[PDB]
Design a protein around this ligand. Structure first.
Ligand SMILES: Cc1c(F)ccc(C(=O)Nc2cc([N+](=O)[O-])ccc2N2CCN(C)CC2)c1Cl
Length: 305
């Protein structure tokens, strides 16, 4: 339809400090969350039912990501490591050591034989999942790296940084293939490829989201009306029903825009602190949102379209 009708269905409480990231498993069954409380929690994606806690990091966790088969998780921590987890057993399979400071972001490639990470140390690292060895260290940026993401076939990596740049990397060679810069270079707080891999969605700490044609190297859409000047807030493409852009905001709301018209179609009220993370379910019209220290809860919202 014209607008979605997301309504609050479940509030997931359990973390005792700020929640940093929420991610749906590719198979749609689970939600994983990470927190400053050093814990990963697993929850039912459709019922919000608490499943289990996964522990081991020595400091707070900034991000979590699923393998393509929904069996593994990778986490990125202030303790300067990433950990690879077998979700079913809760086992830490590997600890990925190499970054010299806080690890902020992580992702598996589609094949899930590789992990990419970004750190406060200004590097992007590519890791082998099976051995846990660092395969490449990319001298990616001149300030902390806020996000890293593989494209649809894993041949490219996009990275964003407080240095105001988005960079595109060849996975195989580690070569920088593109540096994206618009009219200014405010800190880039988030970036990801579109599902089809033709565009990149990037957030900057000037209350702006932008859709880029990275190949042409041109900004196609701009999304505004939300508050984002301090925190690295995750954004998403919603594609299960109407085509939306979804993001958290520092006014405690989840914002939803029409991708094409750039109009705000919904604002979701409920959280009591900054909404730092949102996720969109892979097959159903379900959004997960998570908030910082004064809230500590995760919310599941559902729409008919
Ligand atoms: C709750 C919590 C932690 F326990 C640890 C780190 C963070 C955090 O702010 N991570 C972060 C830091 C920077 N930075 O200072 O350059 C940039 C990006 C992130 N994040 C926020 C969480 N997003 C899922 C991943 C990237 C957060 Cl929110």
């Amino acid at each position: 339809p014209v607008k979605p009708n997301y309504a609050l269905k479940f509030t997931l409480a359990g973390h005792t400090k700020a929640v940093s990231s929420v991610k749906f498993s590719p198979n749609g069954e689970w939600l994983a969350s990470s927190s400053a409380d050093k814990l990963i929690k697993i929850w039912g994606a459709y019922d919000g039912k608490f499943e289990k806690t996964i522990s081991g990091h020595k400091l707070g966790i900034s991000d979590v990501a699923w393998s393509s088969d929904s069996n593994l998780l990778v986490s990125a921590s202030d303790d300067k490591t990433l950990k690879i987890w077998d979700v079913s057993s809760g086992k830490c399979l590997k600890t990925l050591k190499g970054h010299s400071n806080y690890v902020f972001c992580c992702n598996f490639n589609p094949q899930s034989n590789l992990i990419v990470s970004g750190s406060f140390d200004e590097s992007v690292r590519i890791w082998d999942v099976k051995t846990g060895k660092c395969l490449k260290t990319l001298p990616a940026h001149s300030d902390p790296v806020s996000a890293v993401h593989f494209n649809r076939d894993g041949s490219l990596i996009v990275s964003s940084s407080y240095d105001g740049l988005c960079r595109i990397w060849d996975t195989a060679s580690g070569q920088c293939l593109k540096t994206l810069i618009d009219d200014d270079n405010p800190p880039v707080s988030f970036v990801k490829f579109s599902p089809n891999g033709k565009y990149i969605l990037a957030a900057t700490l000037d209350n702006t989201l932008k859709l880029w044609d990275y190949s042409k190297g041109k900004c196609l859409k701009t999304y505004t009306g939300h508050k984002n000047e301090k925190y690295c807030i995750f954004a998403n493409f919603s594609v299960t029903g109407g085509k939306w852009i979804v993001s958290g905001s520092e006014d405690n709301l989840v914002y939803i825009w029409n991708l094409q018209t750039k109009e705000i179609v919904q604002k979701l009220q409920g959280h009591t602190d900054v909404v730092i993370s949102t996720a969109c379910h892979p097959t159903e019209n379900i959004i997960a949102s998570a908030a910082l220290e004064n809230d500590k809860t995760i919310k599941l919202w559902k729409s008919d379209c």
